[PDB]
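Hi R.,

Here are the chain sequences for the assembly we discussed:
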Amino acid sequence: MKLNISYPVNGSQKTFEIDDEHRIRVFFDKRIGQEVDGEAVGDEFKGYVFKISGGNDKQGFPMKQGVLLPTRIKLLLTKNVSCYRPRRDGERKRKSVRGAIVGPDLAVLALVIVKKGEQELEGLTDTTVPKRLGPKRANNIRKFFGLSKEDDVRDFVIRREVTKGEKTYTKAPKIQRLVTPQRLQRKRHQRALKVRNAQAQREAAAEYAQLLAKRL
Amino acid sequence: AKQRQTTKSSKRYRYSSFKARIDDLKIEPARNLEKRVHDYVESSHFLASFDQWKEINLSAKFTEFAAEIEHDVQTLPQILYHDKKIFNSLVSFINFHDEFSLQPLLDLLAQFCHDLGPDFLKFYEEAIKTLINLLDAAIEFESSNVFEWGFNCLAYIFKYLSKFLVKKLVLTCDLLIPLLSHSKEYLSRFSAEALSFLVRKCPVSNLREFVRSVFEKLETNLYEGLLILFTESMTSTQETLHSKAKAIMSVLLHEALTKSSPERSVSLLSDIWMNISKYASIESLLPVYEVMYQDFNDSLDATNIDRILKVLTTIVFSESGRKIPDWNKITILIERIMSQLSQDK
Amino acid sequence: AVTIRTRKVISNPLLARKQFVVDVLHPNRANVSKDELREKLAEVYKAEKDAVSVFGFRTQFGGGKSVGFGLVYNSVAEAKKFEPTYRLVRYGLAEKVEKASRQQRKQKKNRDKKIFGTGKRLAKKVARRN
Amino acid sequence: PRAAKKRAKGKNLSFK
Amino acid sequence: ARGPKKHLKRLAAPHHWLLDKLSGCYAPRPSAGPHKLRESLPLIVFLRNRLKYALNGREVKAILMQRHVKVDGKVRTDTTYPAGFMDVITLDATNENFRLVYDVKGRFAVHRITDEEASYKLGKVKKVQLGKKGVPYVVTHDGRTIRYPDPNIKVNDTVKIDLASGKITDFIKFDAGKLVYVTGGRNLGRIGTIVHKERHDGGFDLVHIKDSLDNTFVTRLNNVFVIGEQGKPYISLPKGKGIK
RNA sequence: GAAACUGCGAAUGGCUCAUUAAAUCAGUUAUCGUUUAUUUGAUAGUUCCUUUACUACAUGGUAUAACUGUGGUAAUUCUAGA
RNA sequence: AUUCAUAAUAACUUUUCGAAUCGCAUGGCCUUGUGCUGGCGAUGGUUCAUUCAAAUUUCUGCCCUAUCAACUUUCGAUGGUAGGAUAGUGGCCUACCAUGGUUUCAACGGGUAACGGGGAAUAAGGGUUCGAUUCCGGAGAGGGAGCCUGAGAAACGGCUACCA
Ligand SMILES: [Mg+2]
Ligand SMILES: [Mg+2]
Ligand SMILES: [Mg+2]
Ligand SMILES: [Mg+2]
Ligand SMILES: [Mg+2]
Ligand SMILES: [Mg+2]
Ligand SMILES: [Mg+2]
Ligand SMILES: [Mg+2]
Ligand SMILES: [Mg+2]
Ligand SMILES: [Mg+2]
Ligand SMILES: [Mg+2]
Ligand SMILES: [Mg+2]
Ligand SMILES: [Mg+2]
Ligand SMILES: [Mg+2]
Ligand SMILES: [Mg+2]
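And here is the predicted structure of the full complex:
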């Protein structure tokens, strides 16, 4: 059965088809989150450590964490869960899910390379995939570049070049939570409004008191 | 801010800021091709527009204004006889600055000048002063429409009094120096267009006196206003220049090279040349180029060497050499300059 | 000869226009086209043809007279701003927008709600699967 | 207090 | 039903609106606001079916979002905003000011007023109570909460409110001999003077009213609105002066 | 300005009269017996108080979609791992 | 009419709120600093009132049947106390108490080709019949049962189980 291995540090991933049953023997009975030694899987994986993350069965139903069974069961899934995306707010659905115990009914098993072995896998450790996007919040940019407080994030925004035909330019994100004169204006205006309201209320109360004093 | 609303949305209705409307606004009443009510007249321009405005505008102020002068506007002889009372009423109601009533009143003021033009001259000074106060008042309450009404009224008056004002064009600008020199850029921009119409209508002789005076004045924002004034006079249509463009450049170029004029004036000419060069195409600039090159050769001298060198440097920098027809003339001009100064220039 | 008569004229600065009732006397004539009437109203009111709208004209039984409703905007831009789209199309001031029939649009909307996201990943998935 | 006092005319053209 | 309704059939709409029964199937449903549904005139009806400035819903929407209409001294953009009794509607472009007062027939009448009259409105004191921090306040018939009222101002009295700032300029007590206006029942829209407030413990109070023609009628207290002392109303009255 | 997150709506409208004989319903009461999005009007300076060893010229992932990429299922508005 | 409104004292809280939000525009002070201050709006937020609503609720009023005369109460029927529950009153439910409650002025049971009403037809008047059906109100989404969300649903062009 197929192994979908991912090296997260590179961001790389590849599928290996399996024929011999013995590496599947060492795979049986394990659970999501547990670790296995690659050398048992094969010499090519000698020294590697694989953590089980999940998988899909012969019928395509996914595995779920938290259920300690080797067979499928129907679970009532809700918001903020794996294996279910609610179409409507408050929607809960009963769907079939494969258990977390690895078995012979599993078609594809997802693995995470915890540790590298002696030999280098051609498709995982040798290759790299860059990050798709860079930091957008100002503090995230400062952390990314280790900028000092005095230094401005404006000069260090990551910019990507786009070339259309012979025209070429660059695009950058809109920094959020950026300290600008407008935010200072808004804060100052809010404080001024609060003090003005307080003064108006005091004047109104004093006027009412004077009216009462006049009558009494 | 960096990008304007170049791509229009499918929305039929879209919000527009006051600044955005002002930026798009341009003072050029001749460009508007819409039917004008006063084009059709039975008795007078004022009455034709006045009857139309009575129905449409319903503001409290205009209705009071209409009632007071309804009797004295029926016939043009009546208007001429009662001209003094009519003008006093118009000024008084405009002074209130009621935006709901400005549009008819301002239009009627322009049509008032139309019916009696030579006689409006005694009213000319007060009329401009009233408009200046209105526009200065218009800054406080933001309304692009009020500015559009005011400046068009100014432009209309110039059109009707084109002949008289041109003879004393320096006097007209003297009234409008505060507008041309105002802190706001658009107010200076709008006025400059209004004056420029009078400028392009000016004879070369009367133009020469005018350019000297403003050139003397240059010796806050007056520099920028004059740049807008001349450049708009030059530009007529996209990638073209006005027919009188050659005469104005010749007059401007002579005075700038004249030593009595300030060095700031040559800078203004350099800025003027750039704006027209970017705006215009190759062909429309050829008559302009020829008159410039001819005059530099004629007026070349020790005292004016530096000024000529400055303007020539403006020519070569302007859009690189794309607008320059023939570089050989520039090379010939250069060696005459070298043969006959400031090293850095 | 044809006589055009305006009555019950109301100025509406809220919409910046003139609302009124049109009476058309057309002896020995079937009726008058909206175009010609717009010409004559525009000339009478000293306004652009584009700013004049007319509609709801009914010929009175027995012929010879028609009654309807008419609008004269203060200027053309306001007319473009306030007219219904269809009347502008009638006058040609606006171009008719070409759209599919309601059933086709609704079917496409259903097909679109079925697919989640951009769908390019679905396309490449089906491509590799087949 | 008294109410506010109460406050376009038909126009004709012949052609053809 | 399971929740608030959002539609109103034309036959179910208030009769006094004068909506043509065959014009459509639905009538404007007044949105939530100062006045109750049945005693309110939505702005769409006022602008279209009464003033005739707009020819259908859509130009009414255009007028409103142009911000040319002001209710209660404030710009409103909701077509179905529930304008009601003694609400001042200003159209500055036309230089027109209206005060919503029923005719003798019982229907909201187009009553034009001056700007000086438009500067103030009248509100019946529906409640007087101490709020938080021991601040007295009065709730009027239009849902306006006015703090620091004059302590003599009591329930069933009327207060003159300045539109611009919303304070109480003056007030009128509910006493015999005052001039009152009927805001409900078959006598709706009639004007008269009080003769007696007949009082029933645990029951609805009844008020006897005599008009200028000396005819006398009885109405429930909830339907009475003081508008001034006899011969000196504090607002301009519609034609007919609430007679018959 | 696609997609997605977020907010609102989907509890209105339309259909039918199965059930229901003090029940529904009509008229008439009460909430001093309670919830109430939204609309409308009001409504909140708390100066200070040990580690000030101090971000308010503005704090985190204790985080993800859309998206890039690797996949399962015959099949669905199915979805797993990174 | 109140233990009402409101205020005050002492503590309390897995305990809240008291703007880390956004558009347009660049005015005013100076000790000339990207110094200080500052306009028109949108969206949020505690509490009160108003509005749209919702839930219970006081009294009177329904066709046929007495060859249906006693019914309800063991498994709440009537009422008392205390508690739980709810937005909240209340046998709504729980624990302990008493024996109560309706009825020949027809209770209870049975039938109803019974949704109720505004109304329609007929008639000289009394009456008789019809009223699913353009408006209001109630219930339902093949038949039961139970629920997430949300202010508002026991929702079904939302969800889960069972029957066909
Ligand atoms: Mg959502
Ligand atoms: Mg009571
Ligand atoms: Mg029965
Ligand atoms: Mg009952
Ligand atoms: Mg809402
Ligand atoms: Mg509020
Ligand atoms: Mg992830
Ligand atoms: Mg209890
Ligand atoms: Mg018990
Ligand atoms: Mg039945
Ligand atoms: Mg029925
Ligand atoms: Mg239901
Ligand atoms: Mg069926
Ligand atoms: Mg259901
Ligand atoms: Mg439904």
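Residues 1-130 of chain A form one domain. The first helix of chain A runs from residue 22 to 27.

Let me know if anything looks off.

Best,
T.
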